[PDB]
Symmetry: C3
Subunit: 318 residues, 3 copies
């Protein structure tokens, strides 16, 4: 019942942040996999807040090229209200997600309770396109732009995103696993001086130094809450094939566990997003089972499960 193992589960069955349908079943397959039980199998305080209901906005006309903006803005608006609710209740928010546009609400609602948070973004992509730089028009590739304070005056008024007040600065976010960056995204990345560890860096330094540099960069000045937004495609498709945008050359299964293991040991985890699990895009039933089983193992390591073993505070020899 430690703070590190005190959890509030929020389901976010949302998919309109991206074209490929099925990512809304994310919260369903993760629950079906036995996540809450396996969390309770560890010494975890688990309270389920259910699946957020998302109202179907039938006529959600696009903003220029950005599609379904009112639907994405409302879903994140509900998530922000719900995330802050479980944070004021002392629990670590565990958003069980569809597409990564929900990171707007998850981080915002987290920010209303802990405005001094830092963000670790595990992803293959930066998701830092603005509504003017996007070529896909999909909002799951834009959430960071709505959330950075330095990007104010650059974000046009998108219908449904009026409640969005930027809550993090460029110095309070670190990327791990980038290997598919748009040209506009790369421009923002280097112009803001955002700390990132692309797969070039992970190869160069190893996931060991990557985590060492990541945590000290974020927890150097002061100790502050950590929000980990984990996009399942941050790991190689050989472990998470059932996702919207897979890119080869990703983080290994071991590296994904080591990231989450090292973040748990800081004791400062405060919010978690497990996004972009799509049980429709599995070429076989095993590809979905493999993806879900991987996202579950990632989450369990976020809350104490260590590869070296775990044990309760008793004498097992008596």
């Amino acid at each position: 019942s430690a703070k590190s193992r005190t959890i509030g589960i929020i389901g976010a069955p949302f998919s309109k942040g991206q074209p490929r349908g099925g990512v809304e079943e994310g919260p369903t397959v993760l629950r079906k996999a036995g996540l809450l039980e396996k969390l309770k199998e560890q010494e975890c305080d688990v309270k389920d807040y259910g699946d957020l209901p998302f109202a179907d906005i039938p006529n959600d006309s696009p903003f220029q090229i950005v599609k379904n903006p009112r639907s994405v803005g409302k879903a994140s608006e509900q998530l922000a209200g719900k995330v802050a609710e479980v944070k004021k209740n002392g629990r670590i928010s565990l958003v069980l997600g569809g597409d990564h546009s929900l990171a707007i609400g998850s981080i915002s609602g987290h920010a209303r309770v802990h405005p001094d948070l830092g963000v670790i973004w595990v992803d293959a992509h930066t998701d830092i396109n603005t509504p003017l730089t996007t070529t896909s028009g999909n909002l799951h590739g834009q959430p960071v732009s709505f959330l950075l304070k330095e990007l104010k005056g650059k974000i046009p008024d998108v219908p449904g995103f009026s409640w969005v007040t930027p809550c993090i600065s460029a110095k309070d976010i670190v990327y791990i696993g980038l290997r598919d960056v748009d040209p506009g995204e790369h421009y923002i990345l280097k112009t803001l001086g955002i700390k990132y560890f692309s797969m070039t860096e992970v190869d160069r330094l190893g996931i060991g130094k990557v985590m060492e540099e990541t945590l000290s960069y974020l927890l150097g000045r002061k100790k502050r809450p950590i929000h980990l937004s984990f996009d399942v495609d941050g790991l190689d498709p050989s472990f998470t094939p059932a996702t919207g945008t897979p890119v080869v050359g990703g983080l290994t299964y071991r590296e994904g566990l080591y990231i989450t293991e090292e973040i748990y040991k800081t004791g400062l985890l405060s919010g978690l997003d497990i996004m972009e699990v799509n049980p429709s895009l599995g070429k076989t039933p095993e590809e979905v089972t493999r993806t879900v089983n991987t996202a579950v193992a990632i989450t369990l390591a976020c809350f104490g499960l260590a590869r070296e073993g775990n044990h309760k505070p008793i004498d097992y020899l008596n």
Copy 2:
């Protein structure tokens, strides 16, 4: 040949330390792949001491929940005498194994001739449950507890193991590759302060520094014979799938060869166990061939094979 390449081969077709049948064929398939001939091709002096006849023990009721204790204890007792015999002949004992419970006999008979030995234990598991902390009753996940001096007093009188005397100390064994550890094992691991590199530590430091710390921890004070107990499930199941208890996220083929190449270069390899190859557990015939090939390759690196190249002390240009 030289001392590092003078080998005495002991087939150990025993399976009653674990539930799944077939691991007794381990010696058969390893020989069939040509392990003897490939060792001789790299200037090894190899003597084949034959496959040990393990007489049937029909009345072998369980000790509490521990299964087949007398068959396991006598096979390890017979292996212990056999290993000590080849060590007295000046040869490196090579045990081609069934289940890992034979390590009780492999290490004990080794210690009888070389009581100052150190153990490197490559495995996904710690194999350190006592007959009382075990929940599976399978003796192949208990051999280390029988061998540790610091556990004297916690091993009950198990039928078949009255010959057993703990021969190695807690500071004379190093684990590499752990990722599947029972809570009672984790308690024992930490309380006795055993040196270990789980998959987490291998991810943090890399196999290069792991082997540098391993060999310095064991050989730093004084040089001494090394005993390597290699469980095949220490590597990832993508390389050794034909094994009893495969666990995802293991050491790679490269990492397995680097461990064994580094151990050879010390010139202090004295005993070697190649355990848990179960040719009946491959989902396809190729998976069996792939497991055996990896096992043969790791055995060949133990006795001189190097990826950088090998050559005889002659003038290849005449």
Copy 3:
């Protein structure tokens, strides 16, 4: 475009340096995957010098055990000629290869214009067998032996290789990825003191320290042109299965990109070989697709593609 992105492309559909047919289709499948256009989409100045026509030599009698000496010798002689020409045009020679015996011509022609070049050899093998140390007799395992000045006199007079002049010293080549070396090659490797990073060294040091030590070893004294000879079997068969001699335990896709990404940032890439892609050696159509696409990615990384992203100095 900039020097590091101005390329002359040479297709070398040659296979008679090795016994498995199909590697001559390397240039065809690589073009077919759109390699040229993909290079142009990242602001590269691409000039296509076409595929080299290799005439058939009927009376190609063996030189002892060495097979097809006059076809291999003439093919590399032509490639050396065409590589010197693109080098004279101030372009980076990109050789879309068949078997690795063509490196005899690629490096010789490159050394004709830049005799101070340094070679990086990404390969599971050393390819340093002499015509007398070889047991296979396949010349795609002998190219480095013809190129090293320190082995002059150890190489017999082989028909087809009278034009060859040893053009690099053993102190100017760095091997990366070794894991299958013949006894005679390893003797040569140790005797001549060639700098090398086998899979053992990549395991021990990591790909980052290997690249830093490689670039420092070749360019520490002074800037000079770099010739990258990339045998596709340097990567693990799980990423490049459609090749003649797959060896397990190879460089990862990531390590291949990292090597090529780091080589680009020096701005000194001057010659490139993409060798030993054999589309007829894939057990499934996907295995061919995987091998080519991996080869394509390694190539684009040699000319600026970066996993962290790219952008023109234009976006806000």
